[PDB]
């Protein structure tokens, strides 16, 4: 679960950075909310698997 979370984080970071390269604050915000919700969901998945 630990390694995967970092992997997911890297992927999410990749999107945020790509969005930033455009200079559009809105695009970065979209990628960031997606990353945040995704990480939260990832916790739900990890927790369910363990249980």
């Amino acid at each position: 679960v630990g390694a995967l979370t970092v992997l997911f984080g890297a992927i999410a970071y990749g999107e945020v950075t790509a969005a930033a390269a455009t200079g559009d604050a809105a695009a970065v915000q979209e990628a960031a909310v997606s990353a945040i919700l995704g990480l939260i969901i990832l916790l739900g998945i990890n927790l369910g698997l363990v249980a």
Partner: protein, 220 residues
């Protein structure tokens, strides 16, 4: 990229398919169906992922991107997962028909809803959501009761696979709602990444758990 994630999903499913096929090479006449079913579950998923990895079935519509192969995969593989659970529980034809029917409504609903622009897609989601609760009821109730009539090992395996299934399947509708099919707060990349993870666990993880119990079941 999306293609890289799809390839990873395909590789994961292929590894699982090969493992299950090999593991069942010398399976007895009573275990056979279980191994074959597992091969079909991950095998079909492997095809779906390869198709998507090749950039086929991508549906960028209504300012969102959904993947037809994902839902077609689900429509065909989830009923096989339910069939596997049903075999362990010892269901008869009637009981199998009930859970397969419920399962099918869930999957068809998610497929149709994902392809429908506008608020009507939430009605389709609702139909699938209700059918899903009915399916969970059967898995935790009638089917668990039925499984309790079999060996301790079978009951234990059923319960283990049942819990993994109910808990993780329950997550898919939230990803559907929050992802591209719904409000689109999750980007296609994040959506696909979470589904690749869930799919591998619900199919390959599911399978290895069964493989890991095989020896114990034979011994009892």
């Amino acid at each position: 990229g999306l293609t890289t994630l799809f390839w990873l999903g395909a590789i994961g499913m292929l590894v699982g398919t090969l493992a299950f096929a090999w593991a069942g090479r010398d399976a007895g006449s009573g275990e056979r169906r279980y191994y074959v079913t597992l091969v079909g579950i991950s095998g079909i998923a492997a095809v779906a992922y390869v198709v998507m990895a090749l950039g086929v079935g991508w549906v960028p519509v209504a300012e969102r991107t959904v993947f037809a192969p994902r839902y077609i995969d689900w429509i065909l593989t989830t009923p096989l997962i339910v069939y596997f659970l049903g075999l362990l529980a010892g269901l008869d034809s009637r009981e199998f028909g009930i859970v397969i029917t419920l399962n099918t409504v869930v999957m068809l609903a998610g497929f149709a809803g994902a392809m429908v622009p506008g608020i009507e897609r939430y009605a389709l989601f609702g139909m699938g959501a209700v059918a899903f609760l009915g399916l969970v009821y059967y898995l935790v109730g009638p089917m668990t009761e039925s499984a309790s009539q079999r060996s301790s090992g079978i009951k234990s395996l059923y319960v283990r696979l049942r819990n993994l299934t109910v808990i993780l399947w329950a997550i898919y509708p939230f990803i559907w709602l929050l992802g591209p099919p719904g409000v689109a707060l999750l980007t296609p990349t994040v959506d696909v990444a979470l589904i690749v993870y869930l799919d591998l666990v619900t199919k390959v993880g599911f399978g290895f758990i069964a493989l890991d119990a095989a020896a114990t079941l034979r011994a009892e």
